[PDB]
Assembly symmetry: C2
């Protein structure tokens, strides 16, 4: 039972090197939502913990938008105002089309705010302040609800 995140590049890249040199073939098993069968877990040479694989921040606004779509699915308008951290292409293309498929009578809109540069010794506090200025501008006089 390996602690932490053994799939993370500093650990996995070194472990793959060892697996290649060992020469034996490797199977990495992932079950469904109910998990792996006891026989699979008993056969394992290494056991990694699924719970440590957390939700990437760019998907937060995706899950929230879906939550609101579902809630509207079962005059006031709602805006999701979110910082647009870059998500993977295999999500972004699908998410743009997902939003386009919403019914026209759904009073929901996603507004994405440009994410500030987070590079070499960037001042996070001022980056956050500038994102917040743009978020509050988009919200105008609406009721403000924060999710964090």
């Amino acid at each position: 039972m390996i602690p932490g995140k053994p799939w993370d590049t500093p650990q996995l890249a070194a472990e793959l090197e060892r697996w290649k040199l060992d020469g034996r073939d490797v199977s990495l098993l992932i079950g469904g939502p109910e998990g792996l069968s006891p026989a699979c877990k008993a056969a394992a040479e290494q056991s990694w913990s699924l719970s440590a694989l957390t939700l990437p921040h760019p998907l937060v606004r995706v899950l929230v938008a879906e939550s609101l779509y579902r809630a509207f699915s079962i005059s006031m308008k709602l805006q999701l105002v979110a910082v647009g951290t870059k998500m993977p292409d295999w999500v972004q293309t699908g998410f743009t089309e997902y939003l386009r498929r919403f019914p026209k009578d759904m009073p929901f809109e996603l507004i994405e705010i440009p994410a500030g540069k987070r590079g070499k010794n960037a001042d996070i506090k001022r980056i956050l302040d500038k994102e917040g200025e743009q978020m509050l501008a988009a919200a105008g006089k609406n009721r403000i609800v924060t999710l964090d």
Copy 2:
């Protein structure tokens, strides 16, 4: 305060009653600015949001591809093919079921089990197919 379906469902009807339009604000990874937090009439926590299970095998495949990229052993990713969310790119399900052979590892998708009466659980049947695929390989599990 926790973001979830029952609390969101109740709050949405409440929001209509005072009539004002509503903006839900999500910051960057480091959080919201002080001015955003000060302006909030209501605050929700996203702590209990988790990665959708079908994306687990996708993120693991990404990790494997990237680790191979910076380094006669064959590695197989043997994963139950849980249905993709509605917002993943069209054709991605098919891509994961027909993973390209020029990738540095193989992706074997176990069909997500589902009428017939028996005493085998769905995960018992999946587990039989997984151990068949794995054979005499070294086994790593993620669960």
